[PDB]
Design a protein around this ligand. Structure first.
Ligand code: NA
Lengths: 293, 293, 293, 293
């Protein structure tokens, strides 16, 4: 199985993509053993990016690696078609889309047609980005089989039965969980890996959990998994999407600028309280020689 | 109380706003007694529009009437600020925003900061577009009072206790329901009216429900409200946002072009089937002398 | 429309029904203008009562008034049948049942069969007690219509559209809201009334709300509804079912003994906080002459 | 890890417990390798049983084995205390309780008091029966930690994150999933096993999934788990709690009488259609030599 990072989008002081900080982060993730980078996912603030900015994000990461899944979805199908077609000039792993978000009560036929449309124009394998809470709808194992053209799925959901169903119904599909808390479990149970937000700031931990589970050292894998869970919990205090920036700086030692409002940067006091929650975890990982310092 | 139309945005065959069809529709609505038009709401596929298209919508509608509430929200705050400031040259009723959508688990503090930021730059009264199922958030009467700067709210929710609460905690606030099925109830109970998707295609009906209810002819208002409910239920068979275009052409006699995929147009068969589902209702409305024929 | 009290069950110190206190309470409610009494509802802890206790509740209240709807439902259909048959000797308004509670994902067919069974043996009109949050399933207007034998429904739900749908699909049915917050609204919108837990402790207020709305004094009705809402909200702080006992004592001046654990009575600190939250309301109500003192 | 059967309660034609059929079923489960029997759980229709009947169940099963967890909860705390006390004379594994069901919005304080009360009188280890969907509330790992007297938990939820949290926060706690679809995954990821309804009718299957996963044959475990899933799915078509009876007779060759209405028995045709759905699976299980012909 794999750890895939849905990579953060660093914004500059004036709210543009900081390509340079993005490249440094990308380099470090690849050097630290991350398998592939998921660009314009939730953790990257995909829905806050224009189609031009979703391209810019791809271009900057592509400077670093070919190991990219390029998320292209949104509520203008022509823009998503255009991004899909432009990816032909990039030797990447695949493209991806979440389901059309915001609008409730969208018919199954229209959902199926949105994805089939993108499969039809895609120059690369297509991955389903399933995120029921964010998008308002679910594209389950059965709908995924009906759509019929997904090479894999990231299933961001707290229901591993639902994730396992993709495998049951689509035996050849790559099936990833979107949770950081299920890295040990996913590797122990025959799934293909995790697209894990927390691998942005603790790629060493996510990779090591996976490796331990693979080696069948489940009690050691769980012990580390449970530590990782505490950082995830700390990150949710002030809002994970903002907190991920602060944590990457804290644990990896380079700056990733700002998120894009209304995903507001943490303030100094929030940043200080968040660091207070994870410093003893940082010491312990250093003690364990998982983190270098 | 008032009926306010969240007016449909007509698109051409190549996915641009059809300004001329928009004007004809806007003009018909006002002539049939609609109080104000809500521009770039859900019904207008606002989340599917770029900032530039949201402004283009305002301009076209403004040629017809200044009775406009102009929706500006999105996930890039700078763009929404820009729209708010640009509205200064338009003599309109107000601007509006829904909450930042898609991202789950946004802190109250961040949500409050988003709206207060738009209040601080707004040259017009600000309306809260509350839509918990679509955006994943609720900005309830307590949070609206915190924010402190709303002249009004559109509460798109079926729970009228929730909508009444805006009035109870904010006695000076204008309080609208976003439901078509609550027009009779809202008028009878002392609220300010409805921002009703169905008023795009049966504005005569929504205005008459309101009028009957004001006259305390509650049973007559409900009979009409109940017929209107059946049209709303029909519209949901193939997807209401797509169906709204077909129902407008059918009942009002002009077309509104195409929706924007992934809000896909009904096909000829679906259109035939929807028309069959509402034909008998049209006959009833004609016998009630609400519609001509 | 009517105000119906789902009457509290007072329990003695040895966890038996305090029949003498129940009778005093029932007599007060009727004297203060309550139309009918709903026995063994949620508010009376019906699900905590054995079939013998449900019958004991009926006999005590029946010593005071025949204006009773007698709730009989539970997870042993033989017992519910026996209670339904036993009620033949009581000259009352109706019997009632909630849907079989606890078990998830019961088939529509089984739910319909349970209700039709009660209808076949019932010597009185049968009322649907609809409470989806509590029972884990909904018996909506369409399922009610398919069941075909309900004289009325109490709809305890936060969705008045759902409640109105009973009237729309079943025009000869009595349709009540289970909410105290909707007395003004239900009266103005053509519904038949409210089975209002808060009428146990402020029967004066619920009746005056309904009277004001009937007189089309909507603003005054809402002003009083909104004060009543504040008392409902305070009752919920420590748990409404327990707080209903304290509030009855506070506003009506007699006590109702203890609830039945695990519906635990409020402790001293909880009572003090609760009273601080309502005493300024209790003064406004005496000033308005709704309460004596 | 272990498989624990939440054992079915067989009822006679006139709705009493069929003690002799219960004993036959218990003995078979134990002989086929089931580790313990969870008596009066959901699958046994525990909420449908009077305290007396819950005691009859224990005494019947106890004649076969002492490997019993005895579920004693309900909405009359005096009865649950009495049951807990009466278990002193049975040399069993533990007693258990689900949270007080039906009543929504019970304060955490009251929930904690209910379980602490049962712990204080219990002469055996206490197990938490967590089932948020059925009871309307969640007693999560944090609340279980607060209560602080549970020996184990059955987490009937689909979210394995939530289940893993009991072990993360309560290291010495025995932690089981209430899901049949998670047998392979629970065994692989270091949890304690599964309280699996479907082990009533296919104990051979559930014990074999576990064993294969224990031997790290995850591929083979999943294949068999996926077959089992298809039986679980079939049982849900006409209602699992009724269907479990039919499936036990079909797979094990002896009958368990009737369920208790409103958990109605399947009819002859529903039974034929259900058997049609699982015939093909029974065939596979025979080829695989998991079942005898
Ligand atoms: Na009640």
């Amino acid at each position: 199985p794999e750890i895939i990072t849905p990579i953060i989008t660093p914004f500059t002081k004036d709210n543009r993509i900081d390509k340079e900080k993005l490249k440094i982060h990308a380099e470090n993730l690849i050097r630290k053993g991350i398998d592939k980078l998921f660009v314009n996912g939730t953790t990257g603030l995909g829905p806050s990016l224009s189609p031009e900015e979703k391209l810019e994000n791809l271009k900057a990461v592509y400077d670093v690696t070919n190991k990219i899944i390029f998320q292209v979805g949104g509520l203008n199908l022509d823009d998503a078609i255009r991004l899909a077609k432009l990816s032909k000039d990039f030797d990447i792993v695949g493209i991806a889309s979440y389901a059309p978000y915001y609008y409730p009560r969208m018919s199954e036929k229209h959902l199926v047609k949105y994805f089939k449309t993108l499969c039809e124009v895609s120059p690369h394998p297509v991955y389903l980005y399933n995120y029921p809470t964010a998008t308002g709808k679910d594209i389950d194992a059965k709908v995924a089989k009906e759509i019929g053209c997904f090479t894999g799925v990231k299933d961001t959901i707290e229901n591993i039965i639902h994730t396992l169903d993709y495998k049951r119904l689509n035996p050849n599909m790559l099936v990833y969980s979107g949770s950081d808390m299920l890295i040990a479990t996913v590797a122990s149970t025959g799934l293909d890996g995790n697209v894990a937000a927390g691998s942005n700031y603790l790629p060493e931990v996510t990779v090591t959990i996976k490796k331990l589970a693979m080696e069948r050292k489940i009690d050691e894998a769980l012990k580390l998994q449970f530590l990782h869970d505490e950082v995830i919990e700390a990150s949710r205090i002030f809002g994970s999407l903002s907190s991920n920036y602060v944590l990457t700086k804290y644990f990896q030692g380079y700056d990733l600028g700002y998120p894009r409002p209304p995903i507001f940067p943490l303030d100094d006091e929030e940043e200080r309280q968040l660091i207070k929650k994870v410093e003893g975890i940082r010491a312990k990982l250093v003690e364990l020689k998982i983190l270098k310092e």
